[PDB]
Chain A
Amino acid sequence: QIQLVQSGREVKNPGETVKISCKASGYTFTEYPMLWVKQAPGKGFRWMGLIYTNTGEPTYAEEFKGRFVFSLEISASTAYLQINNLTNEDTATYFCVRDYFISLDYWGQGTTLTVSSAKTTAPSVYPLAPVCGGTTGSSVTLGCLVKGYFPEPVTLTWNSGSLSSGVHTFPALLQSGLYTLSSSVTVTSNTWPSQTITCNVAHPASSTKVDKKIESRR
């Protein structure tokens, strides 16, 4: 099946490169079209080109091909589009397509990255249990956040899959050159406070990702 599996989100270094890896498999790396995609902050999925993959070429576009330059070893569907030669006016979303009948026949996942070469740190996991007052509802509502990881994208990884049920994250707040975002960890009334409701935040420049349970507050 058409799995143009892109990379995740990004805080892309100005002057550097960032290789959003399009593992474009099941759809075309090794036989079919890998449709290289720049991604607009307004513009949407813009042309970085495309390539029917029976021979093995990627093709470039006018606005996304260029600073974003992509390579392709299509045998595993392997390829990587580098949003590269970074500027503050270079960041956007990114994507691919898995083609058939030269418009695309399957759609690949992509990854959104904002061009910013700034402070580079790993995320802080800000955990939290519910209120000490109240808890007159169905369950316990708490949080796990990606806070204090400058810059983003700071992920929400939650409790080894236990705080991946109910743990709905929001984006990282981009302020002051730092990411601080929260996620509602919902622990059930059967689950919490007998168990937790816990999320965590992730960052590569410190190489950390803190997962915190929604603990007993008292």
Chain B
Amino acid sequence: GVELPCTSYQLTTAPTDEEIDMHTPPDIPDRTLLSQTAGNVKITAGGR
């Protein structure tokens, strides 16, 4: 009914118009490598 001129949102190999960033590199809470000890804590390798 029409070929209306409009925006073709890019689906090609668009490598460099967008920039996925990271500044102040990773900051969040996750401490799941804890192990059991009393005063000298017996932790292992694990978690993050």
What are 23 A-B residue pairs whose CB atoms fall within 8 Å in the complex? A27-B38, A28-B38, A28-B39, A32-B38, A32-B39, A33-B37, A52-B38, A52-B39, A52-B41, A53-B38, A54-B39, A99-B37, A99-B38, A100-B37, A101-B42, A102-B35, A102-B36, A102-B37, A102-B38, A103-B36, A104-B38, A105-B38, A105-B39
A104-B36 Cα distance, complex, nearest whole Å: 10
| Chain A residues within 8 Å of chain B by Cβ, number | 16
The verdict on A215 contacting chain B, using a C-beta distance below 8 Å, is no
Q: Does B40 contact A (CB under 8 A)?
A: yes
Q: Which of B35, B36, B38 has the most CB of A within 10 A?
A: B38
Q: Does A46 touch B at the CB level, under 8 Å?
A: no
Q: Which residue of B lies closest to A27 (CB)?
A: B38
Q: Is the CB of B39 within 8 A of A102?
A: no
- A147 interface residue, CB < 8 Å from B? no
Establish whether residues B40 and A100, one from each chain, have CB atoms under 8 Å apart when the complex forms: yes
Residue numbers of A with Cβ under 8 A of B are 27-28, 31-33, 52-54, 98-105
* Nearest CB of A to B19, in Å: 42
Residues in chain B near residue A104, CB distance under 8 A: 38
Residues of B within 8 A of A100 (CB): 37-40, 42
Contacts of A99 in B (CB 8 A): 37-39
Q: Which 9 residue pairs of A and B lie closest in terms of their CB atoms, listed nearest first?
A: A102-B36, A99-B38, A32-B39, A33-B38, A101-B42, A32-B38, A100-B38, A28-B38, A31-B39
Residue positions of B touching A, CB distance < 8 A: 35-42
Residues of A within 8 A of B35 (CB): 102
Give the interface centre of A28, A100, A104 by most chain B CB atoms within 10 Å.
A100
Q: Which residues of B contact A102 (CB under 8 A)?
A: 35-38, 42
Interface centre among A54, A99, A103 (most CB of B within 10 A): A99
A183 shortest CB reach to chain B, Å: 38
Other contacts beyond A52-B38, A99-B39, A105-B39: 12, CB < 8 A: A28-B38, A28-B39, A32-B39, A33-B37, A33-B38, A98-B38, A99-B37, A100-B39, A100-B42, A101-B37, A102-B38, A102-B42
Neighbouring A residues of B38 by C-beta, 8 Å: 27-28, 32-33, 52-53, 98-102, 104-105
